[PDB]
C-alpha cells in the first residue's frame, strides 16, 4: 500500500488522540442522524461527543 497516500487519507476520516487515530464523528454520524436507541430522542448533537 502507498504509505504516503494512506496517510493523506487518514486525515480525512480520523484524528490522532493520545497517539491513536480516533474516527471522525462527522463521518461516523452521517448528517441525517438522530437519537436511535430505546431512550431519549435527540437531534444530531455531535457537540457532546466532540
Amino acid at each position: 500500500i502507498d504509505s504516503v497516500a494512506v496517510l493523506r487519507g487518514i486525515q480525512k476520516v480520523a484524528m490522532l488522540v493520545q497517539g491513536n487515530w480516533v474516527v471522525k464523528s462527522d463521518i461516523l454520524y452521517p448528517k441525517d442522524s438522530s437519537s436511535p436507541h430505546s431512550g431519549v430522542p435527540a437531534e444530531v448533537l455531535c457537540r457532546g461527543r466532540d
Partner: peptide, 28 residues
C-alpha cells in the same frame, strides 16, 4: 510510538482543530 514516524506537523494540525472546537464548545 507515532513519533517514531517523522511527521510532527500532524499534531499541530490536530491542535488547531482542537482549538477551533474548543472555541465552539466554550460558548456553553
Amino acid at each position: 510510538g507515532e513519533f517514531i514516524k517523522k511527521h510532527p506537523d500532524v499534531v499541530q494540525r490536530q491542535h488547531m482543530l482542537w482549538t477551533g472546537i474548543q472555541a465552539k464548545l466554550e460558548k456553553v
